[PDB]
UniProtKB/TrEMBL annotation, chain C:
It comes from Chlamydomonas reinhardtii. The lineage of its organism: Eukaryota, Viridiplantae, Chlorophyta, core chlorophytes, Chlorophyceae. It comes from the Eukaryota. This is Uncharacterized protein.
Automatic annotation (TrEMBL), chain D:
It comes from the Eukaryota. This is Mitochondrial NADH:ubiquinone oxidoreductase 9 kDa subunit. Its EC number is 1.6.5.3, 1.6.99.3. GO terms for molecular function: oxidoreductase activity. Keywords: Oxidoreductase, Ubiquinone. It is an enzyme of class 1 (oxidoreductase).
TrEMBL record, chain E:
It comes from the Eukaryota. This is Uncharacterized protein. The lineage of its organism: Eukaryota, Viridiplantae, Chlorophyta, core chlorophytes, Chlorophyceae. It comes from Chlamydomonas reinhardtii (Chlamydomonas smithii).
From TrEMBL, chain H:
This is Uncharacterized protein. It comes from the Eukaryota. Residues 89-107 are annotated as: Disordered. PANTHER family: TRANSMEMBRANE PROTEIN.
Length: 546, 125, 82, 64, 144, 85, 77, 107, 88, 117, 108, 443
C-alpha cells in the first residue's frame, strides 16, 4: 500500500503517453487516468490514516543506491513520516479531482490524452519529490515537476505568449534551482549525508539558510520571483489548478518545513513583503485567473511567515497548506466552469445574473470564497487565525511589522474575493454567452473538494487547532472585523480618484518591465559583444593574403 | 471550439537588421520580441523613468518601519517571557540559532545566550 | 444552441418557442428549466457546510463571545485552580 | 492577405531601430547585475578583511 | 458523442499514421533493410554483455567497493570498542589529546586519531619518529 | 524567575518518549499534552466531544504557565526599573 | 539509531552521530590531496578558532566582532 | 486521390468535420481525436495489465517494508503484513495484534 | 449547418436593420438594404461610430480601424459581415 | 498625443477615431457596461458642445488636449474578445496547413543514402 | 502520382517518368534572398570589426576587466584554501621559491 | 595485440572489395566497425577492479608504443566504439569508410597509449584525415579545415621540444618512468597545457571548432564532438598530473580563471547564434571547461567525475548532431528561421530533440545531471566560489537551449515530416545508454 502512492500515477502516465494510448482513445485514456488517480488516492488515504493517527513511519529500499562515489552516497530510498503523509494525501486528493475536471473540460480538445498523461506525470513527480528521504531525490522531484509544468504550460504550442511564459518560468525556476544546488553542496559538505533524518543543525554558516530560502522562494513565487505566476494562466485551467493547489508552489514551503534551518528575520521580511504585494495585486486587476493566482501568492507568504515563526509555526504553516490546497483548486475549477459558460470569456466586466452557470458551481464558489477569506468557523479560518495568533505573540520586534502587514493583506483578500463573487453573480449581466454546462464529473470534483474542506474542519490537520493562545478579546475578533470591512467595501464596489496610484498598482509595480531591461537586454548585449567583438574581433586571427 | 482561422506571418521582403535575433516569429501574426517590454510600446505608455521615480520613494516608505523597529525597540516590548522549559530540555532547544527562546531577557545567561546567536558566513579555520 | 434566442425587428415570436417552457422579455426568450441531480447535490453540500459551521460554532461560542483570558480567568476564580 | 480585413493588414510598421543599448546605461546595469548576483564573493572577501583587521589589531597590541 | 452515449461503438479502422513512413504494398510483408540484422545483432550483443558483466562478474571483480566492505566491517567493529573505552578512560583521552596537540590537531580530533591507525602517514611517522611513540601504546591499550 | 519558580515536572523523559512527544512541547504541562494527544488521536471524527475535559485541562495548565511567564516578565521589568514599583 | 529513537534522538543518538562524523572526516581529510582545503563536518575548526579568538579578544580588552563560540552545532558535534 | 489513402482511416466522429489535420502523421499517442473500433476490449485488457502490475508492486511493497518503531494502535497493514511489529501505546503498554488491552488491565 | 464559417445573408440583413432603427431622428420606413448613412439616414460621424460599436457588440466582432472607416452605408456593413467568419 | 498614422488621418476621421477609442477606454475603465452607459451619454454630450467650432487653431488645441488626455489614459489591461488579436483564445489550435508526405523513403535508392565524400 | 515502385517492391528510379518523382530533395525549402544575404553576413561578420570608440571601450571594460576579476578571484580562492588547510605561503607561477605540494607524510 | 592486428588488416579489406557489389560493401564496412565494439566489451568483461590500476600491459620492444588500460581509457573506448557504427550508417562512399576506419584506429591506439612520444605521434596522425573530411568540395569549408589543422599543428610543435627535453632528461618516454624522474616540470607543463587547451576548446585559442564541427558532415561532426575533445581530458589524466604536479599546482589559478571566463563567454555568446549547428557547437565548450576544472580540482573524486562528464557529453551531444544532420539533409538548410511547427511535423523527432535538450541541460534521470553534480562536488571541495560561479550560470545555457527548441519546434507547421527507421535506429543507442547510465550507472 505504501509504494502504491508513488509508482501508480507514474505507471498510469507512462501508459497514457505510451503507444498503447493509440489503441484506447480519449474515452479509455480518461478511464485509465481516473482509475489510477482513485487507486493512488485510496492508498494515500490509508497511509495518511495510519501515519497521522497511529504514528507509524516506514522507510523503503526501492532501487538500491542511485550513485555512491566518495563519501557521497545517494540511494533510491523512500521514507513516509507525518510530513510526507500529509503532502501525499493532499496532493493525491487535489489531483484526483483535477483529473476528474480535466476529463470533461477539454473534451473537445484534439490531443486530450497527452494532456492527461502530462498531468499524471506532474502528480507522480510531486509524489516522488515528497517521497524523498535524501536531498538528491528532492532535486529529482523538483526538476521533474518543473519539466511537467513546462510541458503543460506549453500544451497549446500554437500560442507564442504561452511559450514565452513557460520559458520565463523555467529560467526563473532554474535560477532558484542553481541556488538550491549550491545549498545542497554546502549541506553535504558540512553534514556528510543527505537523509533529512540525518540532518540536525543548530547553527550553520548562514549561506545554507539564505540559499535554500532563495531557491524555495523561486518555486513559491515570492517577492522578486512572483512575475511568472500570473503569466501561467495561458495554460489550461486544470494545469493552473493543479499547480496552484498542491504542487510546485507548495514544494518550496514543503522543503523549508522539512528542513527548518532558515533564518527568522529574512524569512519573515520576505513573507510579509510578498503577502502585501500579492494582496495589493489581487484587488487591482480585471482578469479572473490572475486574481486567484495572486491570492495563492498571498497564502504562500502567510505560510512563509508561519514557518519563520518557529517549529509550531512550521506545523501551523503545513496545516495552512493542507487547508489552502482544497479551496484553491475549488476556486480555480469554479472559475473555469464559469468561464466556459461565458464562451471562453476570461474578463470580469462581461458577467452577471444567475443564468450563465449551474447552482452547484455558484454554491461551491461561495463556500471556497468563505473558507479562503477566514469566515468564522471554517477551514481557512482555523489556520489563518492560528497563524495570526502565533504571529501576535512573536518574540521578534521585526514580526510586529509583519503582523500589521498580514492584517492589511487579509482585509484586502476579503475585499477582492467579495469583489470577485460580486462581479461573477451579483452584478447585472454584461456579456454575450450563456451555455451552462451541467456535466456530472466536474460537479463531482467540486463535491470532493468541498467534502475535503469539510473534513479539514470536522477533523483537524494537527493538534494545533483547538490549542488556545491567550489574547485580548479584541485581538481575536480583529481578523473577523477586517473580513467584515472587506465585505462592506467590496459590496460597495467603490473606487478612488488617485488614478496615478491605480495605474501603478495595475502595472504589477512594473517588475516585469524592470527585469526586461536591467538584466536581460544587457545579457543580450553581453552576448553580442562577446561573440562579435572578441571571437570575430579581438580573438580573431585573419588571413595572410598572397 | 478549435480550428479558428488565424492570420499567417508573411515572409520579409527587405534587408534584415544585423541583430534580427530578437524578434520572435512563430509563423503566425502577430509576432513578438524576444521578451516583452524590451523595445516598442508598453501597455499604458509608461516609461522606466516613471517607475524608477515612484520606487525611489516607495521602497524607502516600505523599508522604514523595518529599520525603526529593528533599531529602537527590544524584547522588553512583549509583556511576557517565552515558553519556559526545564534546564535539561531548554538547553538543547536554545542551541538552534533560529530558535526564538533566545529572546528571554530573564534567562540566567541572557547576554551570553544572545552572544552565541550571531550569524557568520565564512567558516573559520 | 443558445439558451437565449433573440428575435430582432419585432418579429413574431415563434409559436413553438412559447409556453410555460419559454419566458420572453424585451422580445428575447429564455427557458424555465430544472435539473434534478444538480439541485439535489447542491442542497446536500450546502446543508452539510451550514451544519458544519453551526455545530462547530455552538461547540465554541463561549470561547468567542468572551475572551480566552476572560473565560479561563472566570473558570479559575469560580471553578478552582488545580 | 485574405484575413487582413478581419484581423488587420500589414500596413502598420514596427518602430524599432535594432540598435545596441546605451553604453553608460549598459555598463551601470551590468555592474548592478554583478553586484546582485555575486554577493557571496563580496561576503567572503569582507569576512576575510574583517578577520585580517582583527589579526592586525591583535598584532599591534600584542607587541608593546 | 457518437451514438449519443459514452459506451457507443468505435469509429476507426485502418492504419492510423505511417510509422517511419513505411507503407504496405499489395499485402506483401515489409522488406527488411540491409543494415537491420547486423545493427540488431551487434547492439543486442553489447547489451547482453553489459547485463552479464553487471550481474555475473564476481563482486570483487566487478568493483573494488565490494572487496573492502567485509574487511572494513571488522575494523569498524574492533574500533568501536576502542572508542567506547576511550569514553571510559580520561587518562587515555588526555594522552591522545596531547598526541594530537603534538601533531597539528585540535581537541576535537580525538576520535579522528583513533580511526586512522591503519593510515600511511601514521605508520611512516611511527617508523621515522615523527609520530610519538606513545601513540603505539595508546592503540595497544585501546585495543586491549 | 526566582520569585515565580517553575513547578516540579510531573512527566519524566521516559513517559514523554513513550508518548512520542515532540521535543519542543516538553514543557511544564507535558502530561496534559500527552493525555490530550492520546485522547484526540484515537477518537475519530467526534474528538471535540469525547475529549473536551482533556483539552480544557491542558488549556488551564497552559493558562497557569502563561500567567507565570507574564509575572516573570513583570518582575524582571520591575527589577531593571522599566516599570514603576 | 535515528529511526529507532524517533523524538528522543536529541539525547539518544549523539554518540553514533559523533562516530559517523569522525569517520567522514577521516575519509575526507586523510590523503586529501594537494589542493583540497580541510573539511570539518562538525564545524570543529570553526568553533575552536572561535574559542581562541574569544580568548585573544578577552586578553585584548575590546568588544568581540565575532559570534560567541557554540557548544555544539549539529546533532552530533 | 493517392493510393495509400484507402488504407487510412477517415476523420473520427469526435473530430470537428470542418478540420483537416494531415491524417497521414503517425503520432506516438494516436494523433487527433483518436477513437478505435475495438476500444472497449483494449480498455479491459489495459485494466487487466494495470491490475497485474498493481499486484506485483503490492507484493514488492509488502516485501520491502521496514518499520523501525511500534505503532500507536490498530492498523489495517496487519491483515496483509506479518513483519509489522506488535504495537505499543502512548503509555508504553504492549498491545496484542488486535490492538486491544490484554487481560489483567482490560475489562 | 450552413456556410464555411459564414452566416446567411438574410439574418444578417435583419439584424442590421433591427440595430439601425435605434435613433430618435430615424423614421423606420426609410431604413432598407444598402442605405446611405449621412445622405439618407442623416446620422453624424458620432452616430456612425456608435453604430459601428453597436454592430460590433451585436455580432461580437472587433473590427479593424481602417475597415470601420470604410463603413459608411448599410450595404457596406452588411457585405463586410458577409465576409466575416468570426461573426456570431 | 496619437500615433503618426493617426496624425495622418483626416480631421473628420481623426476626431471619429478619437471618440471611438475614448469610448473603448471608458469601457476599459468601467466597472460594467451599466456603469458605462451614463459615461457614454456624457462623452457624447461633451462633443456636442464642440459641434459648431470653426477656428481651426482652437479646434486643433481641443483635439491635441483630448489626444494627450487619451494617451495619458491608455489602459494596461484592455477588454478584448477572446478570439481576436491579443485575446486569450486567439491562436490556440489552427487547422493544419497542407504538408506533403514521403512514402517508404528508406526503400528508395538503398545502399546509397549516406553522405558524399 | 508517379510510380517509383513496382507492385512487388523494386524501387524504380523513374528517369523517364513524366511526373515529378518524390525524392530526398522533395521537402527542400525555397530560399529567401534577404535571408540568405543576412546569413552570409552573419557567417562573414568578421569584416565588420573596427577600432572605434565603442568597441575599444567595451573590450577593455568588460572582456579584460572581467578577465582580471576572475584571475584575482581565483588567486583569492587559492590562497584562502591554502589558509584553510594550515599551509604556509605557496609558490604560484612567478612567486619566488617557496613550499609546493605539501607532503602526505606531514601533518599540517 | 594479435587480435588488434587482425582487425587492422580486416578493416583494410574494404578497398579490395570491387565496387560492383554495393550490398556487400556496406555489410563489410559496417561489420569492420562492429567487431571492435564486441572486442572492447570482451575487455571490460576481462577487466578487474580489484586488480592493479593498470591491466592488460603490453610493450612493443624498444619501439615505444606502450599500451595499458585504466577505467578512463576503457570507458572512452566503449563510448567511441558505440559512436562509430552510427557514423558509418551515415556514409555512402568508400573513401569515407577508409578515412573513418583510420580515424577510429588512431583514436583507439592513442586511447590506451602510455608513451608521451607515442601519444604525440599517434594522436595527430589524423590531422590530414580531418583536413580532407571537413573541406569537401560540394558542401565543406576549406577555411575550417585550415583553421583546425593549423591550431593542432601549432600545439604539437609547441609541445615537441618539451617532450624531447624530458626524454633526454629521463632517458625514456614511458609514463611510468617519466612520472618517477626529477624533471624541469615547468617547460613540459607549458607544452602540455598548450596542447590540451587547444584540443579541448578553451578560450582564447578555441575558435576552430565552431567552423569545423559545422562545416563537417554528420558522421565527422559526431566524431569531432564526442571524441577529440575527450582526447584532451584523458590526456590530462594520463600524462600531466602523473608527470608534472608542481606546474599543475602553480598554474591552477590561471587554469581556473581561463576555464571560468571560457564558460561564461561561450554561454553568453551562444544566445546570439542564429543557426542550430552553431548553437550545438558552442554548447560543448561549457562542458569541456567544466571537465577541465573538475580534473584540475583533484579534491575528492576528480578523475571519476571528469570521466563521467566526458561519457555524458559523448553520449548526449552526438544526438543533438544527429537531429541537426537529419533536419539539414531532409531540409537542405540549417538556418533557424526555416524551422517551425516541428512537433506536429516530426512528433518522435521533436520528442527526441526535447529529451536530448534536457540531457544537455543536466536534468535528473540523465547521466549529465549526476556528472555535473560530481564535478561541482569536486569543485566545491576546493573552493565554494568556483562552484557558485558554475551554479549561478546554469540558467544561461538552458536559456538558449529552450529558446531555440521552442522556436524551431512549436508554431506554424512547415518543413519535413517525422524521422525514418534508420534515423530512429541511429538515435536509439544514445537514448538507451543515457537512460541506463542515468538510472543505474553503477551496481
Ligand atoms: C477619459 C476621457 C479622456 C478625454 C477624452 C477627450 C475629451 C475631450 C473632448 C472635447 C474636445 C472635442 O470634442 S474635439 C472638437 C470636435 N469638433 C470640431 O472640431 C468642430 C466641428 N468640426 C467638424 O469638422 C465636424 O463638424 C465634426 C463634428 C468634427 C465631425 O462631424 P461630422 O463628420 O459628422 O460632420
Amino acid at each position: 500500500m505504501f509504494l502504491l502512492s508513488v509508482f501508480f500515477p507514474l505507471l498510469g502516465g507512462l501508459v497514457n503517453t505510451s503507444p498503447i494510448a493509440r489503441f484506447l482513445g480519449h474515452r479509455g485514456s480518461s478511464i485509465i487516468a481516473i482509475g489510477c488517480m482513485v487507486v493512488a488516492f485510496i492508498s494515500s488515504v490509508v497511509i495518511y490514516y495510519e501515519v497521522v493517527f497511529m504514528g507509524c513511519a516506514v522507510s523503503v529500499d526501492v532501487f538500491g543506491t542511485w550513485f555512491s562515489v566518495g563519501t557521497f552516497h545517494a540511494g533510491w530510498t523512500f521514507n513516509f513520516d507525518l510530513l510526507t503523509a500529509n503532502m501525499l494525501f493532499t496532493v493525491t486528493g487535489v489531483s484526483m479531482a483535477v483529473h476528474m475536471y480535466a476529463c470533461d473540460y477539454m473534451r473537445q480538445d484534439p490531443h486530450l490524452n497527452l494532456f492527461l498523461g502530462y498531468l499524471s506525470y506532474f502528480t507522480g513527480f510531486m509524489c516522488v519529490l515528497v517521497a524523498a528521504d535524501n536531498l538528491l531525490v528532492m532535486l529529482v522531484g523538483w526538476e521533474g515537476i518543473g519539466v511537467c509544468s513546462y510541458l503543460l504550460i506549453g500544451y497549446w504550442s500554437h500560442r507564442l505568449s504561452a511559450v514565452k511564459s513557460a520559458q520565463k518560468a523555467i529560467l526563473v525556476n532554474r535560477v532558484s534551482d542553481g541556488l538550491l544546488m549550491w545549498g545542497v553542496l554546502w549541506v553535504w559538505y558540512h553534514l556528510g549525508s543527505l537523509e533529512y533524518d540525518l540532518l540536525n543543525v543548530y547553527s550553520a554558516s548562514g549561506f545554507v539558510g539564505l540559499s535554500i530560502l532563495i531557491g524555495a522562494m523561486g518555486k513559491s513565487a515570492q517577492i522578486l520571483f512572483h512575475v511568472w505566476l500570473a503569466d501561467a494562466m495561458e495554460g489550461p485551467t486544470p494545469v493552473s489548478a493543479l499547480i496552484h493547489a498542491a504542487t510546485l508552489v507548495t514544494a518550496g514551503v514543503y522543503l523549508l518545513v522539512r528542513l527548518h534551518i532558515h533564518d527568522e528575520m529574512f524569512v519573515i521580511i520576505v513573507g510579509s513583503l510578498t503577502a502585501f504585494m500579492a494582496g495589493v495585486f489581487g484587488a487591482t486587476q480585471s482578469d479572473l485567473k490572475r486574481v486567484i493566482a495572486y491570492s495563492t501568492c498571498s497564502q504562500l507568504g502567510y505560510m512563509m511567515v508561519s514557518l519563520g515563526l518557529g517549529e509550531t509555526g512550521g506545523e501551523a504553516s503545513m496545516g495552512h497548506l493542507m487547508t489552502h490546497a482544497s479551496f484553491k483548486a475549488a476556486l480555480f475549477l469554479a472559475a473555469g466552469m464559469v468561464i466556459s459558460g461565458n464562451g471562453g470569456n476570461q474578463h470580469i466586466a462581461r458577467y452577471g445574473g444567475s443564468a450563465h452557470s449551474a447552482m452547484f458551481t455558484m454554491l461551491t464558489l461561495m463556500v471556497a470564497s468563505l473558507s479562503l477569506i477566514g469566515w468564522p468557523e471554517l477551514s481557512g479560518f482555523y489556520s489563518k487565525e492560528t497563524i495570526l495568533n502565533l504571529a501576535a505573540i512573536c518574540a521578534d520586534p521585526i514580526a510586529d511589522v509583519a503582523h500589521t502587514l498580514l492584517l492589511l493583506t487579509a482585509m484586502l483578500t476579503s475585499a477582492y474575493t467579495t469583489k470577485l463573487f460580486y462581479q461573477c453573480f451579483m452584478v447585472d449581466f454584461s456579456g454575450s454567452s450563456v451555455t451552462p454546462v451541467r456535466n456530472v464529473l466536474p460537479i463531482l470534483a467540486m463535491a470532493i473538494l468541498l467534502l475535503d474542506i469539510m473534513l479539514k474542519v470536522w477533523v483537524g490537520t494537527n493538534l494545533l487547532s483547538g490549542m488556545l493562545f491567550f489574547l485580548p478579546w479584541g485581538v481575536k475578533t480583529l481578523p473577523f472585523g477586517l473580513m467584515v470591512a472587506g465585505i462592506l467595501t467590496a459590496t460597495a464596489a467603490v473606487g478612488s480618484e488617485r488614478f496615478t496610484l491605480i495605474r501603478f498598482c495595475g502595472s504589477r509595480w512594473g517588475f516585469d518591465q524592470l527585469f526586461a531591461r536591467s538584466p536581460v537586454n544587457p545579457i543580450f548585449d553581453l552576448g553580442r559583444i562577446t561573440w562579435a567583438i572578441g571571437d570575430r574581433g579581438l580573438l580573431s586571427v585573419g588571413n595572410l593574403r598572397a | 471550439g478549435a480550428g479558428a482561422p488565424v492570420k499567417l506571418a508573411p515572409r520579409p521582403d527587405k534587408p534584415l537588421p544585423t541583430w534580427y535575433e530578437l524578434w520572435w516569429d512563430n509563423g503566425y501574426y502577430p509576432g513578438q520580441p524576444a521578451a516583452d517590454f524590451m523595445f516598442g510600446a508598453w501597455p499604458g505608455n509608461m516609461t522606466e523613468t516613471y517607475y524608477l521615480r515612484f520606487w525611489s520613494v516607495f521602497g524607502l516608505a516600505l523599508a522604514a518601519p523595518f529599520y525603526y523597529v529593528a533599531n529602537f525597540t527590544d524584547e522588553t516590548r512583549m509583556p511576557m517571557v517565552p515558553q519556559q522549559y526545564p534546564a535539561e530540555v531548554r538547553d538543547v532547544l536554545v542551541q538552534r540559532r533560529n530558535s526564538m527562546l533566545k529572546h528571554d531577557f530573564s534567562a540566567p545567561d541572557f547576554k551570553e545566550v544572545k552572544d552565541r546567536a550571531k550569524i557568520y558566513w565564512t567558516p573559520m579555520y | 444552441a443558445n439558451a437565449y434566442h433573440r428575435t430582432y425587428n419585432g418579429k413574431p415570436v415563434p409559436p413553438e418557442l412559447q409556453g410555460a417552457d419559454y419566458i420572453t422579455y424585451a422580445g428575447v426568450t429564455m427557458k424555465k428549466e430544472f435539473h434534478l441531480f444538480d439541485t439535489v447535490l447542491s442542497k446536500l453540500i450546502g446543508a452539510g457546510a451550514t451544519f458544519t459551521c453551526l455545530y462547530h460554532f455552538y461547540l465554541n461560542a463561549e470561547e468567542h463571545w468572551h475572551g480566552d483570558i476572560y473565560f479561563f480567568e472566570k473558570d479559575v476564580q469560580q471553578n478552582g485552580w488545580d | 492577405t485574405s484575413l487582413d480585413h478581419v484581423f488587420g493588414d500589414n500596413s502598420n510598421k514596427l518602430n524599432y531601430n535594432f540598435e545596441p543599448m546605451g553604453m553608460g546605461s549598459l555598463f551601470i546595469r551590468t555592474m548592478v547585475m554583478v553586484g546582485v548576483f555575486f554577493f557571496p564573493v563580496f561576503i567572503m572577501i569582507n569576512d576575510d578583511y574583517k578577520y585580517t583587521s582583527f589579526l592586525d589589531k591583535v598584532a599591534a597590541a600584542k607587541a608593546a | 458523442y457518437p451514438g449519443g452515449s459514452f459506451w457507443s461503438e468505435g469509429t476507426q479502422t485502418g492504419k492510423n499514421g505511417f510509422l517511419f513512413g513505411e507503407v504496405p504494398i499489395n499485402g506483401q510483408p515489409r522488406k527488411t533493410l540491409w543494415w537491420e540484422p547486423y545493427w540488431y545483432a551487434g547492439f543486442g550483443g553489447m547489451g547482453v554483455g553489459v547485463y552479464l558483466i553487471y550481474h555475473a562478474k564476481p563482486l570483487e571483480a566487478l568493483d573494488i567497493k565490494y572487496w573492502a566492505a567485509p574487511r572494513a566491517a571488522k575494523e569498524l567493529e574492533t574500533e568501536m570498542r576502542m572508542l567506547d573505552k576511550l569514553n571510559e578512560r580520561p587518562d587515555l583521552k588526555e594522552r591522545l589529546v596531547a598526541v594530537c596537540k603534538d601533531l597539528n590537531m585540535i581537541e576535537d580530533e580525538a576520535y579522528d586519531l583513533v580511526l586512522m591507525r591503519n593510515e600511511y602517514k601514521v605508520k611512516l611517522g611511527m617508523h621515522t619518529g615523527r609520530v610519538p611513540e606513545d601513540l603505539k601504546a595508546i592503540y595497544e591499550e585501546l585495543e586491549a | 524567575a526566582d520569585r515565580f519558580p517553575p513547578p516540579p515536572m510531573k512527566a519524566t523523559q521516559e513517559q514523554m518518549d513513550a508518548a512520542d512527544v515532540p521535543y519542543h512541547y516538553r514543557d511544564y504541562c507535558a502530561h496534559m499534552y500527552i493525555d490530550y494527544k492520546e485522547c484526540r488521536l484515537t477518537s475519530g471524527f467526534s474528538w471535540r466531544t469525547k475529549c473536551a475535559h482533556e483539552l480544557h485541562a491542558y488549556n488551564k495548565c497552559e493558562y497557569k504557565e502563561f500567567k507565570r511567564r507574564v509575572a516573570i516578565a513583570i518582575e524582571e521589568k520591575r527589577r531593571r526599573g522599566l516599570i514603576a514599583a | 539509531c535515528v529511526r529507532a529513537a524517533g523524538t528522543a534522538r536529541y539525547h539518544k543518538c549523539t554518540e553514533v552521530m559523533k562516530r559517523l562524523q569522525a569517520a567522514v572526516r577521516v575519509a575526507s581529510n586523510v590523503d586529501r590531496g594537494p589542493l583540497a582545503r580541510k573539511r570539518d563536518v562538525g564545524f570543529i575548526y570553526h568553533n575552536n578558532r572561535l574559542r581562541e579568538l574569544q580568548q585573544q579578544a578577552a586578553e585584548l580588552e575590546i568588544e568581540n566582532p565575532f559570534p560567541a563560540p557554540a557548544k555544539q552545532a549539529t546533532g552530533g558535534y | 486521390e493517392p493510393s495509400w489513402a484507402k488504407q487510412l482511416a477517415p476523420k473520427s466522429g469526435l473530430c470537428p468535420p470542418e478540420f483537416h489535420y494531415n491524417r497521414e502523421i503517425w503520432y506516438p499517442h494516436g494523433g487527433f481525436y483518436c477513437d478505435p473500433k475495438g476500444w472497449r476490449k483494449n480498455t479491459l485488457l489495459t485494466l487487466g495489465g494495470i491490475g497485474v502490475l498493481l499486484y506485483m508492486t503490492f507484493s514488492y511493497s509488502t516485501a520491502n517494508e521496514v518499520r523501525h518503531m511500534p505503532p500507536k494502535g490498530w492498523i489495517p497493514s496487519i491483515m496483509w503484513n506479518s513483519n509489522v511489529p506488535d504495537p505499543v501505546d502512548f503509555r508504553g503498554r504492549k498491545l496484542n495484534r488486535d490492538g486491544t488491552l490484554p487481560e489483567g488491565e482490560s475489562s | 449547418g450552413f456556410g464555411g464559417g459564414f452566416l446567411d445573408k438574410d439574418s444578417v440583413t435583419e439584424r442590421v436593420l433591427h440595430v439601425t432603427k435605434h435613433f430618435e431622428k430615424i423614421d423606420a420606413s426609410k431604413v432598407s438594404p444598402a442605405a446611405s448613412f449621412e445622405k439618407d439616414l442623416g446620422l453624424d460621424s458620432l452616430d456612425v461610430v456608435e453604430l459601428v460599436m453597436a454592430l460590433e457588440e451585436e455580432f461580437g466582432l472587433e473590427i479593424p480601424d481602417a475597415e470601420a472607416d470604410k463603413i459608411a452605408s448599410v450595404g457596406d456593413a452588411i457585405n463586410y459581415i458577409c465576409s466575416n467568419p468570426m461573426a456570431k | 498625443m496619437a500615433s503618426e498614422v493617426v496624425l495622418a488621418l483626416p480631421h473628420k476621421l481623426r476626431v471619429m477615431r478619437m471618440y471611438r477609442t475614448g469610448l473603448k477606454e471608458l469601457i476599459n475603465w468601467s466597472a460594467n457596461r451599466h456603469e458605462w452607459y451614463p459615461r457614454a451619454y456624457a462623452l457624447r454630450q461633451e462633443f456636442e458642445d464642440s459641434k459648431a467650432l470653426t477656428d481651426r487653431e482652437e479646434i486643433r488645441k481641443k483635439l491635441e488636449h483630448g489626444e494627450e488626455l487619451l494617451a495619458r489614459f491608455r489602459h494596461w489591461e484592455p477588454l478584448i474578445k477572446p478570439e481576436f488579436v491579443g485575446g486569450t483564445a486567439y491562436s490556440i489550435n489552427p487547422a493544419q496547413p497542407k504538408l506533403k508526405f514521403i512514402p517508404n523513403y528508406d526503400a528508395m535508392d538503398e545502399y546509397k543514402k549516406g553522405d558524399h565524400l | 502520382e508517379a510510380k517509383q515502385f513496382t507492385p512487388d517492391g523494386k524501387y524504380m528510379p523513374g528517369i523517364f517518368s513524366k511526373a515529378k518523382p518524390l525524392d530526398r530533395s522533395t521537402q527542400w525549402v525555397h530560399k529567401n534572398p534577404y535571408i540568405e544575404a543576412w546569413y552570409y553576413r552573419r557567417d562573414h561578420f568578421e569584416n565588420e570589426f573596427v577600432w572605434n570608440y565603442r568597441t575599444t571601450i567595451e573590450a577593455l571594460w568588460f572582456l579584460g576587466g572581467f578577465t582580471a576579476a576572475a584571475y584575482a578571484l581565483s588567486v583569492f580562492a587559492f590562497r584562502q584554501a591554502d589558509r584553510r588547510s594550515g599551509y604556509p605561503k605557496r609558490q604560484i607561477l612567478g612567486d619566488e621559491p617557496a613550499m609546493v605540494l605539501p607532503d602526505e607524510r606531514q601533518f599540517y | 595485440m594479435f587480435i588488434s592486428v587482425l582487425l587492422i588488416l580486416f578493416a583494410l579489406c574494404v578497398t579490395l572489395i570491387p565496387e560492383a557489389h554495393y550490398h556487400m560493401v556496406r555489410v563489410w564496412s559496417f561489420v569492420a566497425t562492429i567487431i571492435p565494439m564486441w572486442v572492447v566489451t570482451w575487455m571490460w568483461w576481462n577487466f578487474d577492479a580489484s586488480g592493479h590500476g593498470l591491466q592488460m600491459l603490453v610493450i612493443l620492444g624498444r619501439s615505444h608504443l606502450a599500451f595499458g588500460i585504466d577505467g578512463v581509457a576503457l570507458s572512452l573506448m566503449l563510448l567511441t566504439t558505440v559512436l562509430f557504427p552510427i557514423c558509418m550508417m551515415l556514409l555512402r562512399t568508400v573513401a569515407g569508410f577508409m578515412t573513418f576506419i583510420l580515424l577510429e584506429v588512431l583514436v583507439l591506439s592513442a586511447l590506451c597509449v602510455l608513451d608521451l612520444l607515442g601519444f604525440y605521434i599517434l594522436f595527430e596522425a589524423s590531422l590530414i584525415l580531418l583536413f580532407l573530411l571537413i573541406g569537401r568540395a560540394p558542401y565543406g569549408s576549406l577555411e575550417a579545415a585550415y583553421k583546425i589543422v593549423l591550431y593542432t599543428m601549432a600545439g604539437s610543435l609547441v609541445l615537441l621540444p618539451t617532450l624531447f627535453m624530458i626524454y633526454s632528461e629521463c632517458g625514456t618516454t614511458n609514463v611510468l618512468y617519466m612520472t618517477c624522474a626529477y624533471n624541469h616540470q615547468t617547460v613540459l607543463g607549458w607544452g602540455l597545457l598548450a596542447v590540451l587547451a587547444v584540443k579541448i576548446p578553451l578560450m582564447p585559442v578555441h575558435l576552430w571548432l565552431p567552423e569545423a564541427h559545422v562545416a563537417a558532415p554528420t558522421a565527422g561532426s559526431v566524431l569531432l564532438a564526442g571524441v577529440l575533445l575527450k582526447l584532451g581530458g584523458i590526456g590530462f589524466l594520463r600524462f600531466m598530473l602523473p608527470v608534472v604536479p608542481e606546474f599543475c599546482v602553480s598554474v591552477f589559478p590561471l587554469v581556473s580563471t581561463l576555464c571560468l571566463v571560457s564558460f561564461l563567454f561561450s554561454t553568453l555568446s551562444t544566445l546570439r547564434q542564429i543557426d542550430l549547428k552553431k548553437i550545438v557547437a558552442y554548447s560543448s565548450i561549457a562542458h569541456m571547461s567544466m571537465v577541465t576544472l573538475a580534473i584540475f580540482s583533484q579534491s575528492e573524486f576528480s578523475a571519476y567525475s571528469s570521466s563521467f562528464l566526458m561519457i555524458a557529453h559523448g553520449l548526449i551531444s552526438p544526438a543533438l548532431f544527429l537531429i541537426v544532420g537529419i533536419l539539414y539533409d531532409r531540409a537542405h538548410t540549417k538556418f533557424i528561421l526555416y524551422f517551425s511547427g516541428l512537433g506536429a511535423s516530426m512528433p518522435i523527432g521533436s520528442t527526441l530533440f526535447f529529451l536530448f535538450t534536457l540531457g544537455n541541460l543536466a536534468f535528473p534521470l540523465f547521466p549529465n545531471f549526476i556528472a555535473e553534480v560530481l564535478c561541482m562536488v569536486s569543485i566545491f571541495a576546493v573552493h565554494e566560489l568556483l562552484a557558485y560561479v558554475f551554479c549561478v550560470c546554469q540558467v544561461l545555457g538552458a536559456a538558449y537551449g529552450f529558446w531555440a527548441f521552442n522556436r524551431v519546434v512549436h508554431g506554424l507547421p512547415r518543413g519535413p515530416a517525422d524521422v525514418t527507421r534508420t534515423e530512429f535506429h541511429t538515435v536509439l543507442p544514445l537514448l538507451i545508454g543515457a537512460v541506463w547510465l542515468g538510472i543505474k550507472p553503477m551496481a
